[PDB]
Structure formats: C-alpha cells, structure tokens
Design a binder for this molecule. Structure first.
Ligand SMILES: CCCCCCC[C@@H]1S[C@@H](CC(=O)N(Cc2ccccc2)Cc2ccccc2)C(=O)N1CCCCc1ccc(C(=O)O)cc1
Ligand SMILES: CCCCCCC[C@@H]1S[C@@H](CC(=O)N(Cc2ccccc2)Cc2ccccc2)C(=O)N1CCCCc1ccc(C(=O)O)cc1
Ligand SMILES: CCCCCCC[C@@H]1S[C@@H](CC(=O)N(Cc2ccccc2)Cc2ccccc2)C(=O)N1CCCCc1ccc(C(=O)O)cc1
Ligand SMILES: CCCCCCC[C@@H]1S[C@@H](CC(=O)N(Cc2ccccc2)Cc2ccccc2)C(=O)N1CCCCc1ccc(C(=O)O)cc1
Lengths: 270, 270, 270, 270
C-alpha cells in the first residue's frame, strides 16, 4: 500500500535520524568548502596527525607514536572504538524495524552479527570523498595517502574502500533512502544459524517494496536505481569478506590486541 | 516501452532456446519431475559410480582407478570440459543481444570473460535439487551425498553450491525468465578493463526493464521477484570467488601434471 | 617460470634414464620390492661368495681362493671399477645439463672431478636397504652382514654408507626426483680451483628451483623435503671423505703389486 | 599460515636478541667506522698486542710471554673462554624455540652437543671482516695476518674460518634471518643419539617454513638465498670437524690445558 509505504518509509527515517548522528547530510556539509562555521581539521601526515591530537579529540598517546605502541595501532584500535559505537546505533535502528524485534531471539543477533559490518561500509561512504575520509564525528578529515602510507598490513586497509564509496555515492542516494537500504540488509535471511527464515524475508519484502518506490519517487531520473542499488550489496560482501581476512591476520599477529565483546562476538571468521 | 519489452523478452527466449541444450524445462521433467520416460542412471556411492561410469557417453579416459587419477580429480576435470563448452553457448547466445555485437571487441571479450561463470553456476541450478544433480546431458544423476564423499579439496565443493540451488530454484523461474537474467549477467558493466561502460549499461538497462515486465507477467502473484532474483547475483558472485579459490588452490597442487599441455591449454582454467 | 621448470625436469629425467641404465624403480623392483621376476643371487657367506662369481656376471677374474689374490681387496676393487663406468655415465648426464658445456673446461672437469663421488653414493643409496646391496646389474645381492665380516680395513667401510642410506632412502624419492638432485650437485659451484663460478652458481639455482617445485609437486604431503634434502649434500660430503681414508690408507698395502701398471692406472683411484 | 609464520620468527628474533649480546648489527657498526663513538683497539702484532691489556680486560698474562705461559695458548684458552659463554646464550636461547624443552631430556642435550659449534662459527662470521675478527665484547680487534703467524698449529686455525665468514657474510643476512637459521641448526634431525626424531623433525620443518618466508620477505631480490643459505650448512661442519680434530692435537700436545665443565661434554670427535 503506497500510502502505507511512504509511512513505512518515513517511519524508518526518523529512526535512522535518532540512531545515527553523522547523517550523510551533515557529513557532506563538512566535506564541501561552502559553509565554514567549522570545517574539518585535516590530517595528511604525522605533523598534522599529531597537530590534530590537540585540535581534535584523540584519547590516545598524544606525543610519540613509535616505541610506546606504534600509531597504525592507535589508528586501528581507533576504528574498533568507533566500531562498538556503530553496532550500538545499528542494532538500535534494528530495534525499530517493523516486526523485527519479534523474530527468534537467536536469529536477531545473527542478523546483527553479520549485517553490522556490511552496514558499516554502507554508511562509511557518506563519510568519505576521493581525497580522504572524515574522522571522529566528521570533526576531522584524514587523507587517503596518510593511511595508504601505513605499515605493511593496515596500509591497504582502507584504500579498497574508496572505489566502493566513490561509486556507491555516485548513485547519489540521500539520507531518506539509506535507512531503508540499511533496513533491507539486516533482514537478509541468508546467514548461518538462520533458525526460521521466511519471516525475515516477509519483513525484507516489506522493506524491498518500500525502499523500491522510495527510489522512483526520491529519484525520478535515477532509472533502475533500485536494481543498481540492490546490486551494490555484492560489493559490500567482498569488502566485509576481505576486512575479516585482515582481522584474521592482525590479531593472531597482534595477540596483546584486545577486542570489545560486541566485536569479540561479531568478529566471526567465515 | 512495453510491447518492445515484450518482444525483447521473446527474442532472447528463442535464441536461448537455440543456444542451450539442457534447459530448466527438460531438466526438471527428468529431475524431481516424474515423467517416468527415459530416466537417468544414478551415482550414490563410490563403486555405484564405476559400476555405471562405463554406462555413459563420456570422452577422455576409461575407468582406471589406480595410477590413473582418482574419482575426485576426474569428475572436476570433467566439469571444466562441459563448462568450456557452454562457454561457446553463452558466447553464440551473447551474439544475439540487442546492440551487443556492436560493442568494442575488447569489452565483448570482457563481458563474456567474467559473466560466463555467473551464467554457468546459475544454469547448473536447473539440474540441481536438495538431493543431487543431473549429469552428462543429464543422462545420469550425481548425488549430493555421493559427491560429498570425495577427496579433501573436492569434498565440500558443491555442498555450498547446492545451498544456492535451494534458494535460487526456490524462485521457480522458468527459461523465458532465465533468458534475460542471463542477458543481464553478460553486460554487468562493472568488470575490469571495460573501456566503454556507457553502452554496456544502456543495453543491460533495456534488459532490466525487459526482465522486470517479464517476471511480472509470468509471476503476477509473487512480488519483488525481480528485486529478489537480482539480489541473488551476490550469491553467485560469492560462488565465483570460491571456485577461483578452491581452484587457484589446486594450481599449486597439480602442476607436476604438466601432462595436460594441449588439453591444459584448450582449457586454461575458467 | 613454472612451465620452464616442469620441463627441465622431464628433460633431465629423460637423460638420467638414457644415461643410467639401472634405476631405483628397478634397483627396487629387484630390491626389497617383490615383482618376483629377476631375483638377485644372494651372498650371505664367504662360502656363497666363491659359489657366486662362478655365476656372477663379472669380467676379469674368477673366485680364486686358491692362493690367488684375496677376497676383500677383490670385492673392493670391484667397486672402484664400477665407479669408473659410473663416471662415464655421469660425465654424460653432465652434458644434458643446461649450458653445462658452455662453461670453461677448466671447471667442467672440476665439477665432475669433485661431484662424481657424491653422485656415486647417492645412487648406491638406491641399490641398498637395511639388509644389503645389489651387485652386478643388481643381478646379485651382497649382504649388509657378509660385508661387515670383511678384512681389517674393509669389513667396516660400507656400514656408514648403510647408516647413511636409510635416512636418505626414507624420503622415498624417485629417479625423477634424483635426476634433478644429481644435476644440482654437479654444478656445485663451491668446488675448489674454479675459474668462473658465476654461470655455474646461476645454473645450480635454476636447478634448485626445479628440484624445489618437484618435491612440492611430486610429494604433496611432506614439507621441507627440499630442505631435508639439501641437508644431505653434507652426509654424502662426509662419506666421500671415507673413500679417501681407506685409499691413502690402502697405499700402505696393495701397492707393491706391480703386476698392475696399466690397470692401477685405468682406474687410478677416483 | 603466513600469519603463524611471520610470528614464530618475530618471537624467535627477540629471543636471539635477548640472549646473544653483541649482535651482527651492532658488530657491523664497529667494523665500519664511519662513526667515532668507541672505535676498536686493533691488535696487529705483539707490539700492539701488549696494549689491549691496558684499555681492555684481557683475562690473560701481560708481562713475560713464553715461560709462564705463551701467547697462542694465552689466546686459545681465551678463545674457548667465550666458548663456555657461547654455551650460555645458545643454551639459554635453545630454551626459547617452541617445543624445545618439550623433548626427551637426553635428546635435548644432543642438539646442544653438536649444533653448539656450528652456531659458534655462524656467530663468529658476523664478527669478522675479510681483514680480521672483532674480539672482547666487540672492543678489541685481532687482525688476520697477525694470527696467521702464530705457532705451527694454531697458525692457520682461523684463515679457513675467515674464508667461511667472508663467503657467508655475503648472504647479507641479518639477525632476523640468523636467529631462525640458528634455530634450524639446533633443531637438527640427523644427530648421533637422537632417540625420537619425528618430533625434532616436525619442529624444524616449522622453523624451516618460517625461515623460507622470512628470507623472501626480507630479501626479495636475493634469489635462492634459501637453498644457498642452507648450502652453507655443509660448510660449517667441515670447519667443525677440522676444529674438532685440531682441538685434539692441542689436547695431547698440551696435557695441562684444562677444558672447563661445559666444553668437555660438548666435545667429542666423529
Ligand atoms: C591503521 C589503519 C586505519 C584505518 C582507517 C581510519 C579512519 C576511521 S573512519 C572514521 C569512521 C568509521 O570508523 N566507520 C567504520 C569503519 C569500519 C572498517 C573500516 C574503516 C571504517 C563508519 C561510521 C561513522 C558514522 C556513522 C556510522 C559508522 C573514524 O573516525 N576513523 C578512526 C580514527 C580516529 C583518530 C585517531 C588517530 C590517532 C590517535 C593516536 O595518535 O593515538 C588516536 C585517534
Ligand atoms: C571433483 C569435484 C567436482 C564435483 C561436481 C560434478 C558435477 C557435473 S554437473 C554436469 C554438467 C556440468 O559439467 N556443469 C559445469 C560445472 C560443475 C560444477 C561447478 C561449476 C560448473 C554445469 C553446467 C551445465 C549446463 C551449462 C553450464 C554449466 C556433469 O556432467 N558433471 C561432470 C562429471 C562427469 C562424470 C564422470 C566421472 C569420472 C569419469 C572418468 O574419468 O572415468 C567419467 C565421467
Ligand atoms: C671390500 C668392502 C665392501 C665394498 C662394497 C661392495 C659391493 C658393490 S655395491 C655395487 C655398486 C657400486 O659399485 N658403486 C661404486 C662405490 C660403492 C661404495 C663406495 C665407493 C664406490 C655405485 C654406483 C652404482 C650405480 C651407478 C653409479 C655408481 C657393486 O656392483 N659392487 C661391486 C663388487 C662385486 C663382487 C665380486 C667380489 C669378488 C670377485 C671374485 O671372485 O674375483 C668378483 C666379484
Ligand atoms: C692461538 C689460537 C687463535 C684462535 C682465534 C682468536 C679469536 C677469538 S674470536 C672472539 C670470541 C669467540 O671465541 N667466538 C668463536 C670461536 C670458535 C672457534 C674458532 C674461533 C673463534 C665467537 C662467539 C661468541 C659468542 C657466541 C657464539 C660465537 C675472541 O674474543 N677471541 C679470543 C682472543 C681474545 C684476546 C686475547 C689475546 C691475548 C691475551 C694476552 O696475551 O694477554 C689475552 C686475550
């Protein structure tokens, strides 16, 4: 029901609004150069990384970076802090998903467990441009080279995230559309331990129709955006696929490396 | 354009029908479909094979289980052949798509170079069911169980592909439907090295359009099929990466076997 | 380039076969293995000894235990003679080796002058077993015991070769493996009195890269065989020195035997 | 896995680092004096020789040279003074290679028994440049020709060593590299009195895999640095025995010459 779909739509909107602070909307208004209430303090090298330690809030080893826990570490054990934060919001927005919180207790988790990372890169896009990506609330702009120049491992960590973002953003999906896309993802139903599935599908349908008319409407010209959009999902897989294989490395190679429970539990290889 | 979408959809059925031997139709009839006609022989256990292997139109090596390849190695080195074939089938077909042949020969090489697999794993499905799969012109039937009983690298090869058929075939798609879905696979347009993506997406779109109306007209009581059937290429793409991982792996596991040369080159890998 | 390697192998294999009539495959077909075909006349005692040459395919002297020469010596002398044929064999296989002839002869000789012995014990390793050693076209089999009961500086010369063997043999290597293994020795590059090592050193590396891919291939389950192998040019390097000890030790014995000249020459000592 | 491999090594390095004092790196500092910090005090003859006993703590005689003990013996003992200490480090280190102590006691010792020397000559290498060898905690220095003149025996009890050092050094391997090749050494598999080897073997294989990768990574240009480095494994033994056999002489030649607790036990011909 159209009238019920705009409802469904609009319904997921405010939620996304209330579960996530850095909307694509704000995150884009901190990337262009137009308004300069406060632009993003940019990070491109060490002098700046450090300079941004004072200018920006980085509750980590302020002075050196080498001998007392190298930086890539602090820069990596950083995302993992934002991380916890993501699943916080993410899960939250999932709580609001129509009928979602009804399904098997065991499954909801699964849904979150996986779809949480896939959703992390979905969002993440609106956070970056081909010059770099914003950090800590978009209160800063870490450059693409700064990262690219890092230690043998982590060094390739993000570089493979732009090609996706660049393209994903190229569809020009505003906020109003994201939430529902963030909705579908979650109600996938093709995950391990998926106890009872048809329901998660009945839901995902609700949100596949909804989201559908949202593109047509919100993007009259964006012919085939839906198909185009749903397609992106594969992109998001490999990325999550690959990412994992990294934490697969990193930890059995960084055994002092801690890991918050929500992550400890979603960080499940394969 | 409706009517035009109507004919495109037919255009492709015809050709597909002409470029493709074992269809989902005739397969079904044979598989889970009764039609107790010219039923196939079955392989349910290692010997049950040998004691059947001599009962079919193969072409390469006789039943030699000692210093002459083991079941495993011979069944895969058999897919390859068959795949190698359908490659041309998908090729001749591809040469029937509106505007295709008009593409640059490099992209035509590309479009085909990657989508072939996806095309393949999708069609393999018209021969699968939870229990097994058609073999040798579907003149036989390999069991998911039997197959499961094979050498270490090969054992869990189909198990996860089998899962796909489950979900893919769950859509109960008919040939006229696969006919376009398969056309979309060829002109995916995101492939590496395409030098003219404009047109490749121009056609494809006219195909997503053509597809949609199809899935509609023939499945009026099943919404989001299109959007479902679409959000399936990620499963395929997923498989694609597996094959090429469960394979590259075998490269440095069967190189000594440089007794493949001309047959090894006539095949290469895909 | 793996293609390059996979062939160098068969090339050298070929030549190992063409150059070396008796192989392991056979020194094994008649050794402990069965194939009960051309059973090797055994020598367990001094008594069987004399009763043997009157049947053994030897060419020169008869089992003259009528105050005509003495056994041990006689049984030793039969070795050095063998090795002389050996050298021919090996001196030929040498030619098969990539640009082994493009090197200054003031090295080619050396390489052979020094390697030869090693290649002599490496093959002997295949003619034995914890229980003995094949003799005369393997058309015979001297015991591990009988030889122990031999004269003062003789009844305890091979033991180490046996002690050795075992180990080596345990790599269940095949002549196709050994071909390449032999090659790598020849171009040992660390031979004293070398003139232009560069080329040599280069080749042996190619060889080393061929051998290495071999074991990886030929033997898929046994890592570090390659290493467990290069750890063997050492034992051989030792055993070789035995060959000297008894020799410069033999001088003080079989010497005044001036009814030898053009024979103690044809064989000299190496 | 390359993950578990780049780790063993990493572990194996600090070990080396925290066990063996003067490193190859710290050493190559001294030898290449483009610095001033604390240059060595070189001994090029008796003239100079009696000066190290001024700025250096030469635990040996300074007044008269022959009667109340001569110079060669006054050095040799000094050589084997490090020996006892050579024990320490490795012995200490030995207990760091995973699964070491986990072996049957006796067997443990064996690895130490013999391998205790090959490392020594391995570690002495980094100590010496074509022109000589550092001595006394890297402070003092003892020339080649200086030692090349000593009493009849010792006279050349180093010349051949240098050669090896000279040649070995050229592997341009560092401590990361060594530590492992030091681990592989101890972790033999062909020692006189090895009850249970499959284990020893299974352990080295591990160190050997680590090693392999380590060399690639660190020396991407260094073609075959592996095989080559393993080749040296032979070389080290020649010297060993030669030291072994010429340490004999000095024994029955100099009957009062003692052989501190440790040394004796790890000293045995054959
Ligand atoms: C070594 C490899 C580094 C990898 C990439 C670094 C950029 C990330 S991206 C951004 C948001 C986010 O994490 N995401 C998800 C994500 C997951 C995987 C990969 C990359 C990004 C998106 C998010 C934002 C907004 C809403 C929802 C979700 C952020 O604040 N980042 C964290 C860095 C903060 C600054 C810092 C620097 C130095 C120090 C110090 O000197 O100690 C301390 C702190
Ligand atoms: C060891 C691991 C592999 C396991 C899977 C095997 C199933 C296939 S399914 C069928 C068609 C096809 O080839 N495909 C290709 C494919 C398969 C698996 C994965 C990916 C792609 C499906 C297809 C049909 C139509 C069009 C496109 C593609 C077939 O003939 N099969 C091939 C085997 C024939 C039997 C045989 C056995 C031994 C011997 C002997 O040596 O003596 C003789 C005959
Ligand atoms: C004295 C101590 C014992 C020494 C070992 C004796 C057995 C050898 S082992 C074998 C191979 C070989 O020679 N080699 C060389 C080698 C082995 C060990 C050490 C040094 C050198 C290896 C070879 C084989 C294949 C290819 C290349 C090289 C062989 O034909 N043998 C030759 C002897 C035949 C018997 C005989 C005895 C007496 C009389 C009589 O009544 O007059 C006649 C015949
Ligand atoms: C006549 C025999 C000559 C033999 C070789 C001499 C060089 C050695 S090398 C070095 C340490 C070491 O032993 N090695 C190994 C070794 C083994 C075999 C041969 C040669 C060297 C290095 C090592 C350390 C720790 C671990 C592993 C390896 C050292 O301090 N050296 C000892 C001499 C110190 C100076 C000295 C001289 C004169 C006087 C006096 O007149 O008062 C007093 C002291």
């Amino acid at each position: 029901e159209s009238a019920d779909l705009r409802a469904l739509a609009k319904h997921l909107y405010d939620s996304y609004i209330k579960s996530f602070p850095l909307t694509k909307a704000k995150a884009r208004a901190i990337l262009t150069g137009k308004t300069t209430d406060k632009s993003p303090f940019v990070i491109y090298d060490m002098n700046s990384l450090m300079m941004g330690e004072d200018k920006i809030k980085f509750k980590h080893i302020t002075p050196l970076q080498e001998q007392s826990k190298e930086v890539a570490i602090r820069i990596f054990q950083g995302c993992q802090f934002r991380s916890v934060e993501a699943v916080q919001e993410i899960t939250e927005y999932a709580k609001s998903i129509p009928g979602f919180v009804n399904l098997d207790l065991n499954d909801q988790v699964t849904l979150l467990k996986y779809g949480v990372h896939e959703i992390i890169y979905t969002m993440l896009a609106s956070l970056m441009n081909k010059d770099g990506v914003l950090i800590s609330e978009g209160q800063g702009f870490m450059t693409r080279e700064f990262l690219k120049s890092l230690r043998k491992p982590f060094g390739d960590f993000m570089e493979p995230k732009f090609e996706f973002a660049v393209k994903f953003n190229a569809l020009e999906l505003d906020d109003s559309d994201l939430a529902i896309f963030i909705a579908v993802i979650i109600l996938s139903g093709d995950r391990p331990g998926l106890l009872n599935v048809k329901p998660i599908e009945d839901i995902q349908d609700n949100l596949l129709q909804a989201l559908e008319l949202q593109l047509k409407l919100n993007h009259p010209e964006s012919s085939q955006l839906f198909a185009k959009l749903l397609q992106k999902m594969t992109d998001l897989r490999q990325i999550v696929t690959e990412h994992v294989q990294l934490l697969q490395v990193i930890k059995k190679t960084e055994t002092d490396m801690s890991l918050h429970p929500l992550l400890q539990e979603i960080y499940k290889d394969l």
